[PDB]
Amino acid sequence: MKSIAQEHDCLLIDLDGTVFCGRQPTGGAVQSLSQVRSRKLFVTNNASRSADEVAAHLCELGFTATGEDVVTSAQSAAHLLAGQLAPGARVLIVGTEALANEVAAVGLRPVRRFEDRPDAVVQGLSMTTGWSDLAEAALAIRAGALWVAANVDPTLPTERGLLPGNGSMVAALRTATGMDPRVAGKPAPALMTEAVARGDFRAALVVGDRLDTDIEGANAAGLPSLMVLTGVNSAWDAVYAEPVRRPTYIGHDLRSLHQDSKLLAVAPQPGWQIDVGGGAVTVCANGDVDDLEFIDDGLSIVRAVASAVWEARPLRIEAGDERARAALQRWSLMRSDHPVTSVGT
Amino acid sequence: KSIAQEHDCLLIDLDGTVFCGRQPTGGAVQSLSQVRSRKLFVTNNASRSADEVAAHLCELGFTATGEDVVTSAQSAAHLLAGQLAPGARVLIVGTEALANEVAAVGLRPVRRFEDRPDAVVQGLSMTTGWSDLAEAALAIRAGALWVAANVDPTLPTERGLLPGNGSMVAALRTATGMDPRVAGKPAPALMTEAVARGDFRAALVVGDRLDTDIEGANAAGLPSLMVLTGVNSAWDAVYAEPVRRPTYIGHDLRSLHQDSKLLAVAPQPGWQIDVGGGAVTVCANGIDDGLSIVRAVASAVWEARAADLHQRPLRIEAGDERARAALQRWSLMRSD
Ligand SMILES: [Ca+2]
Ligand SMILES: [Ca+2]
Ligand SMILES: [Ca+2]
Ligand SMILES: [Cl-]
Incomplete structure (x- = not known):
């Protein structure tokens, strides 16, 4: 009923692929944050620019920020x-x-x-x-x-x-x-613990796309994390992440801030049945073939597989039917070290 | 008949060998002036031009031109x-x-x-x-x-x-x-290029550093003379892995005028050696420039350790007081 952003009094938003795609802001970033009422703190491992300089560039890109909102x-x-x-x-x-x-x-x-x-x-x-x-x-x-x-x-x-x-x-x-x-900086918990201490926030959420900085940092700091899948390997990396690098939630991008946290959580999923056995995690679709009741934001299979893999050399991801097959490949989770693509680069 | 007289040209390392910082190594100027084979000065640095390196050599008292330098x-x-x-x-x-x-x-x-x-x-x-x-x-x-x-x-x-x-x-x-x-060193091409420069048939590498000069020499199929004026010690030579083992060892460039048989790492008449029980133990019995015991000890260690297998280092010990003093001079013993 409430959005994940409404369940938190501040967001520690990573200034990497989470918000920037080189030249422009990432798809949906400015629109989503403009509708967030809680405090938005922008956290960066970069130590080259002052807080004020970071804010000015963020503003230039269409975001709203002042130096007080930036932690470096x-x-x-x-x-x-x-x-x-x-x-x-x-x-x-x-x-x-x-x-x-x-x-x-x-x-x-x-x-x-x-x-x-x-x-x-x-x-x-x-x-x-x-x-x-x-x-x-x-x-x-x-x-x-x-x-x-x-x-x-x-x-x-x-x-x-x-x-x-x-x-x-x-x-x-x-x-x-x-x-x-x-x-x-990240993965050390101090940056995040300092951000939280700045405004004396009580229910902070880390938002980022890097397991070894944002997510590990969050876990080290005892904060919950939302990982966004900005990269082609983000889904695969989440699934196979070591314990200290496991996110609480998984979202597509910053639109996830306005989704229900229960939908975002890494947990078993109603649309997917998972069978773990014989070195593999086998995924099967649940409804009738033309049933769309379980299709939500498109990421439910990643949450399912991640959850099955986290609760226990690496397990193989395998499809038990046509729908699982297509949905796994959408997220590049079917690999022989790299996902086969239609055209090679 | 000296070691220098046995070679077409010498591939001489710069720092640690010819000079050390501000000063030429002991007896270097006189020793090089009396060698009549081709002297090529060889440096792993790519910052200075061949002419600049030669200019530096001249400033220290070694007559050299750009054409005598290999970078x-x-x-x-x-x-x-x-x-x-x-x-x-x-x-x-x-x-x-x-x-x-x-x-x-x-x-x-x-x-x-x-x-x-x-x-x-x-x-x-x-x-x-x-x-x-x-x-x-x-x-x-x-x-x-x-x-x-x-x-x-x-x-x-x-x-x-x-x-x-x-x-x-x-x-x-x-x-x-x-x-x-x-x-550069230890890739052999730097040295095998230098010999092409003059089509030489019997070159000798001279240097102070096992992992560049001596390793490079061995990769190039060239024999080598280690001097002790620079980075590596007699201890380091004794325990050098196969690929970094030199042919000859001398104090400094005055060694270029000593007999190659005297300089070679090999058994020595003066020193009897027993390898066993985790030790190389040395006794005196029976020319010496002072490095005879090191050549003996290195030869024994190298003969006992033919290949670069992660094996226990042999400890060096004396079976009499003569060997003790000479081993201690080169820091080849351990105490607590
Ligand atoms: Ca309502
Ligand atoms: Ca739907
Ligand atoms: Ca040197
Ligand atoms: Cl260089």
Whole structure:
């Protein structure tokens, strides 16, 4: 009767494929959020832009947001460091002035080179970061500096294609030093716990499309999650997800915010009978062949299969009739490592 | 009859071997001035031009020209020319010296993905940044052929160990999921190209680093002389896996004027060795430049461990006080 969005006093919406499709907002995103009355907080693992800059770009894209609605990993990385370093302690910045400013804001002293004697290194993406900047960081790390990364995402999605992410720049430093950083952003629960503490919200919901950041982060933070299937492998990835990466709910896109949570939950489904046995999970359709009473948002079979697989090397997804067959293939759940498509790329 | 007199040309590693930082290695200048075989100076770095590297050598007191130097940039260029059509566009990550070596083999150096490269070549430049890596990552993902000058994780300097080409390669591997072809040491082509340069029949590699100089030499089918002025120690030589084992060991470049029989890793008259009970145990009984015991110990360990199987390291022990002092000099014993 109520929508899932109405069951929550705030939404932590991931700023990845969940809301952006490169150039434009994702299909249905702006319309859906405009009808949400609860607080909308936009959370990003990107530490390159200030909260205000993120908000301005969101507005440009047709969304409504101010800096107060944006939470970034620059902020959580600064808090992580400030919680274990002394007041005024020096921190070498790899990244933008936005990152440096977040460090300054929590009582620490941002610094740009090894000879300035940093106690720590904080690393976020900047498109002007270069070899010499990394050389300063490598010296600091070798001399025992605490090393915090905003995220370890290998790529940065853009219009041009997939470019090196902060995770790529971390890898260079890992090769140079033999060390790994501590990650302040997702999947660490602090970013989300900080978002919730900002407005003292009591019934928060995580909304995102990445199992290893959004969903794992949510589970780590003890919050429920709505996973949206933005990618071709999202359905498959959900089904085969390890326990800490399992979402509470599964939706197609942000239209799901106005659907009933009971319909969205990963659970057994009335339209699908599942038989688990002999290394396989076999799915059969329930109604008469021309019965449409069980067709709702199209994702009921994914919820069914995920639920059967979660309650226990990997099980094979198999069809027990024509309808299951077509519905499994719609969600690319029938594979021989990749789903066969009509035209190959 | 010295070891240098037994070879057409010497493939001499630069840093750690010829010089260490600001200074030439002990006796290097005099020893090289008296060798009459061809001296090629060989470097895994692709940042500096052959002329720049020669200029540096001159500044330290070694007369050398551009033609006496072999770089990874040159090896990378040759590799590209063997895989690409003439005039093919190659995106450069690294210095203009690298871009020029690519042009020199008839390829077209380029900087952007929009220039539609067929390949990416990667060497270190201290001005390479995110934007440069972004361009190369696009090319690599779209299927461009990817060559790396070297895959060394670090670059040693006056101020410490800084990020090397291998670190920058690691960034692109993470961004793309792809892996480059490696042009420099220990890939043998760098060295087997250097011998072609003069059609030499009996070359010798000289270097300090087991995982580049010596591994490269063995892959190239060339014999090798390890010096101890650089990265690796006598301990490291003893425990070197089969692919990184040198033919000869000496203190420094003065060894080029010693008899090759004296330098060879092999049994020695002065040192009796018993292998067994998890130990190599050494006794004295019966020329020495001081490395005789190391050559004896390495030979025994290598003979006992023919293949790179994950086996228990043999411990090195003394059966008398003479062997104890000599083993301790090279840090070949363990205590608690
Ligand atoms: Ca009602
Ligand atoms: Ca219906
Ligand atoms: Ca060397
Ligand atoms: Cl290089």
